[PDB]
Amino acid sequence: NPIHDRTSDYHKYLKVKQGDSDLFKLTVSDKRYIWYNPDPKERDSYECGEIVSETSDSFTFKTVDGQDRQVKKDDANQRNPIKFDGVEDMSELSYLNEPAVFHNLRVRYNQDLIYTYSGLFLVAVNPFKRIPIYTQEMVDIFKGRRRNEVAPHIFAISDVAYRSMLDDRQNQSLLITGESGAGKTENTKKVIQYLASVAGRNQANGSGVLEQQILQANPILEAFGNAKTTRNNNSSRFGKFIEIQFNSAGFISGASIQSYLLEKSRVVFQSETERNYHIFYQLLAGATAEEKKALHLAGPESFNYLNQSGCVDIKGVSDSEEFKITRQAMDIVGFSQEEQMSIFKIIAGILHLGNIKFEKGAGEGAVLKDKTALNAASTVFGVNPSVLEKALMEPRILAGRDLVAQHLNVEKSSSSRDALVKALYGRLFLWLVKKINNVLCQERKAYFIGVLDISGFEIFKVNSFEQLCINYTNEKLQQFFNHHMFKLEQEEYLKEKINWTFIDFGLDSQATIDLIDGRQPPGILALLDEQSVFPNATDNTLITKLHSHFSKKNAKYEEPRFSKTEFGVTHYAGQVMYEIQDWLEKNKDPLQQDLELCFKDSSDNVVTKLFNDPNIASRAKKGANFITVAAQYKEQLASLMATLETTNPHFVRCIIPNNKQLPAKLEDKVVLDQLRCNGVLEGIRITRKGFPNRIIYADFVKRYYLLAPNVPRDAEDSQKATDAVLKHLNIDPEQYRFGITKIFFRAGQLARIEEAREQRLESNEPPMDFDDDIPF
Ligand SMILES: Oc1c(Cl)cc(Cl)cc1-c1[nH]c(Cl)c(Cl)c1Cl
Ligand SMILES: [Mg+2]
């Protein structure tokens, strides 16, 4: 058995190595230690010290330098006996404090053990290197097992969610949190792989094609939705909720993807060191010379949208190679050969639109002297060059019921051109998801397991509207964890009259959430929207109004003294300064009508569908104004959060080791901040101090059959039939508790103590067969 075979890859890559005789001598020692700060200023840098003596209220130890210090037993972060070092579930630690938790993760990390349980949820520290722990062999390991039977792994928590989906007939969800680069996407891929395995149909015609397409749906989304940012080479620039559908029996019947917040502005601009979306680079370097000449494509350096960051390649990634994988993925999912060609003739078109150079004419209006880029764009898009030109520089609008042609200056024509580009890309991205959904969505499933893979918390030198929406979302997800771990848990105990004194874990980011999406009084997004439909509003009137409402009034808001165009929001993961530039236009997300008219007449099927299809080219309208981006998003997110509330949540906390994307470099300061703001320790405390399991009094006749005074499934008094199979083995009485309608178990009695009554190999058929047929 791989599990019990100390030579298996499983025991080599998922278990803690056997300590040697020298480590044993240290393990059996009587000496005690404490975690302390050598430099009181650097509170996250710890060293180990031996406790040499104690008072009734203090400990005295010895600093690595031989120095001696005294601390109060209450302010002491004691070090757990080393037999705990590497423990797979930290809720089992004797001492639960920051240095102790970080240490255990470190010990496991140093051995390439990136997974560790922290009570009910899983913690994943990004290794930044490959570890052979995701093979089909590994999958077949964890298929069918108890979480406490196998080692910590993303597969394990995946199986658990899967078993719970069946045993309870309830929909589940895998919520994977983490700042940018932490490992959310990578783990998301494993959840799907595992589920498409243990639940897929026998790999065959359709029987193994559905789950094959499900897996190929993501490589597509990645080429168009991911890009290199300063924090992650493969950063997801869009959020994703993936539903894995199962039939009544329990088999995969399909899936659907719901995307959120594509960072459209990236197509036309990238900070020094960033890249545009991967797809642009894969095309230029992976297309045939004929395709290259058919789309008038050159090198990345010959396009404004690709030669501004100073970076066109990623260390260890062959864009030419990835292009093959994307195409190959499009084939499998079901994209026609024409569609694909269209898909690249919009991508190629976008690059050309970027090269259009507008210039100041004789007046203030713009003019296009060199039309090489313009004609090339029109060419591949299949639209009239003359019409697009006029639409770009001279769009028509209404003025008091009068059609008057505009003549935009250089700056404005440039923006309109960018506006067109972003609309094309965003719509194209939406189309792909739609196309992909139709292929995977073809069955009325009953249960589903939702996998959430959002853009993680991020901070850059310059943070704009996009970052606010991203961080607001991560703030909601964190509060979703706070809710289901501390609030809902304690309201249960409350109504359950189990005798619990309320605990305040100090984890609540509702103030910050309100400050952003509040309506009454109005939060940032509200004020933003208000300004967006104000005729005379400007980025200046917006920042001023925001300061007016929150400066020195909201505790999570800050009007900086060093700038007049930024405001700081204090998030769970830290304070972020936001630059207000362009927020109004970004919120309104305008696009000249002429531009759309121009493209509605494209000779290309994909292009026309992006401009004629209501569910893609249309915008929900609020009265005389279109719905803003802030409002649309808030709406979308609230919906998602509404869906998760109807599922049984399984949490996975991804942790980034450092900020350099380097392996074997676990920085304590970087890791502890995350452990604190994620509420990892409070989540462990709530489990050790509480009662997770809670069966109803009625259905309490489940695994409890005659293991006491004879009492089968039946009893006519429930409160009574309950303390009945328990007292036999005289289980500790304050190791559980009785509630108004349920029975709670501390630190999991069902597993800790109940190991004889259940999980036995005796008590079913051996306690009753001694005199089977032979009695005289
Ligand atoms: O990107 C857009 C711009 Cl600029 C304007 C309008 Cl009126 C609609 C969109 C739009 N609609 C839909 Cl539906 C998607 Cl998806 C996108 Cl993107
Ligand atoms: Mg990601």
Curated annotation (Swiss-Prot):
Mark the residues carrying the PTM N6,N6-dimethyllysine: 129
Which residues does the record give as ATP binding sites? 178-185
How this protein is processed and modified after translation, per its record?
Phosphorylation inhibits thick filament formation and reduces the actin-activated ATPase activity.
Residues covered by the Myosin motor domain: 85-758
Q: Subcellular localization, per the record?
A: Cytoplasm, Cell cortex
Can you give the residue ranges of the Myosin N-terminal SH3-like domain? 29-81
- List the residue ranges of the region (Actin-binding): 637-659, 737-751
Q: What does this protein do?
A: Myosin is a protein that binds to actin and has ATPase activity that is activated by actin.
Record's miscellaneous remark: Dictyostelium myosin-2 has no K(2)EDTA ATPase activity, perhaps correlated with the absence of a Cys at the SH-1 position (688).
- Describe its partners and assembly state: Myosin-2 heavy chain is two-headed. It self-assembles into filaments. Hexamer of 2 heavy chain subunits (MHC), 2 alkali light chain subunits (MLC) and 2 regulatory light chain subunits (MLC-2). Associates with elmoA.
Q: Which family does it belong to?
A: Belongs to the TRAFAC class myosin-kinesin ATPase superfamily. Myosin family.
Q: What is known of its domains?
A: Limited proteolysis of myosin heavy chain produces 1 light meromyosin (LMM) and 1 heavy meromyosin (HMM). HMM can be further cleaved into 2 globular subfragments (S1) and 1 rod-shaped subfragment (S2). The rodlike tail sequence is highly repetitive, showing cycles of a 28-residue repeat pattern composed of 4 heptapeptides, characteristic for alpha-helical coiled coils.
- List the protein's name: Myosin-2 heavy chain
Q: Which organism is it from?
A: Dictyostelium discoideum (Social amoeba)
Q: Which residues of the full protein are shown?
A: 2 to 761 of 2116
